[PDB]
């Protein structure tokens, strides 16, 4: 179900970050995630994986290229659920034809803003408002730490969308 499409995304983000940003799990981080609280979780085991790197712009491009690549592979009736995911997570009213750019334009214009590039706080914190899952097997997710506040901003943006799919 949802987990089948998030796992390939969490593994395309990882791969693209390793060939497009020369990253690794063994690589030091400019910014690390301190605490991952999920206000109201019910079946979401969200672990923070460290895949840090240096080109903050390439991290943002890699996650976007991974987010878009995973979107084309969706079925026509499945990619119809997405315009609700934006409107629920970012209140950006979009349509199936206008998603890919309006995601990019949000990510590029929000995650390169001075408010996220100049945080200077190395220990950051992630706050996801909602997430739901089954008791027997919870939806399993990951916050890939890119190492930068702007690249992690894109992950959080992508993360805010997927957690809004369970509802």
């Amino acid at each position, epitope marked *: 179900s949802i987990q089948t499409t998030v796992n390939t995304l969490s593994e395309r983000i990882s791969s693209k970050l390793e060939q497009e940003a*020369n990253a*690794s799990a*063994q*690589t*030091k*981080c*400019d910014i*690390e*995630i*301190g605490n991952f609280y999920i206000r109201q979780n019910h079946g979401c085991n969200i672990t*923070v994986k*460290n895949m840090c790197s*240096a*080109d903050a712009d390439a991290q943002l491009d890699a996650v976007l290229s991974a987010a878009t690549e995973t979107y084309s592979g969706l079925t026509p009736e499945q990619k119809a659920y997405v315009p609700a995911m934006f409107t629920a997570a970012l209140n950006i009213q979009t349509s199936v034809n206008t998603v890919v750019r309006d995601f990019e334009n949000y990510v590029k214009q929000t995650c390169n803003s001075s408010a996220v590039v100049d945080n200077k706080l*190395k*220990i950051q914190n992630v706050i996801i408002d909602e997430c739901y899952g089954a008791p027997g097997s919870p939806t399993n997710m990951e916050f890939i730490n890119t190492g930068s506040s702007k690249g992690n901003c894109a992950i959080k943006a992508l993360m805010q969308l997927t957690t809004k799919a369970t509802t």
Partner: antibody, heavy 120, light 93 residues
């Protein structure tokens, strides 16, 4: 004006235990990866452990893995390396450093050094 | 990962040049740092890099008798952080 004072080293018998401490002063401890490095008598500079700014991601070496434990208390500005199940190969002078998070990852300041000798 | 430092022992007089190389196995990138350990003293840093990586060099040129020490190289981005064999410099007299 930065310094890193090491303490806790000395003589123990094989299988012994020492908690080496590193008291920091002069910077924001919360913003630096703190590490521990061992120089064996005469020859060899070798890494032992490294801890993050929150203590959430801890990386060790393979020779000291499963035995040693690194930790940190950022309010008392200290770094510790608990050396359990010691052996003779771990006889060395142990340094603590501050990886340059704010600048270029590298050890800009090291510590004086606490000597550890493990013999029966 | 494994950094292979050469030459293990070099010696040139005051005012002349020495060349120390930290040839690596895997491409490490631009992340190499060089360290100086004065005899019997805690190691100190000299130079650093950041952003291939198979070969790297360090040339200390205006040699002073104060530069007699042991020099080490290190992978500063990827764990396990490994150092080099180490090169001892001796200033001639």
């Amino acid at each position: 004006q930065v310094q890193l004072l090491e303490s806790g080293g000395g003589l123990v018998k094989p299988g012994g235990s020492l908690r080496l401490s590193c008291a920091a002063s002069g910077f924001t401890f919360r913003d630096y990866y703190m590490s521990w490095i061992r120089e064996a008598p005469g020859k060899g500079l070798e890494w032992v452990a490294s801890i993050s700014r929150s203590g959430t991601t801890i990386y060790y070496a393979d020779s000291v893995k499963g035995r040693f434990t690194i930790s940190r208390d950022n309010a008392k500005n200290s770094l510790y390396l608990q050396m359990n199940s010691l052996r003779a190969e771990d006889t060395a002078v142990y340094y603590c450093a501050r990886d340059e998070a704010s600048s270029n990852y590298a050890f800009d300041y090291w510590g004086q050094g606490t000597p550890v000798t493990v013999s029966s | 990962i494994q950094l292979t430092q050469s030459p293990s022992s070099v010696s040139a007089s005051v005012g002349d040049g020495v060349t120390i190389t930290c040839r690596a196995s895997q491409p490490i990138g631009t992340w190499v740092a060089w360290y100086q350990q004065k005899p019997g003293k805690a190691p100190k840093l000299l130079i650093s890099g950041a952003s291939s990586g198979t070969d790297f060099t360090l040339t200390i040129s205006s040699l002073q008798p104060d530069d007699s020490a042991t020099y080490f190289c290190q992978q500063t981005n990827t764990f396990p952080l490994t150092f080099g064999q180490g090169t001892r410099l001796e200033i001639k007299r």
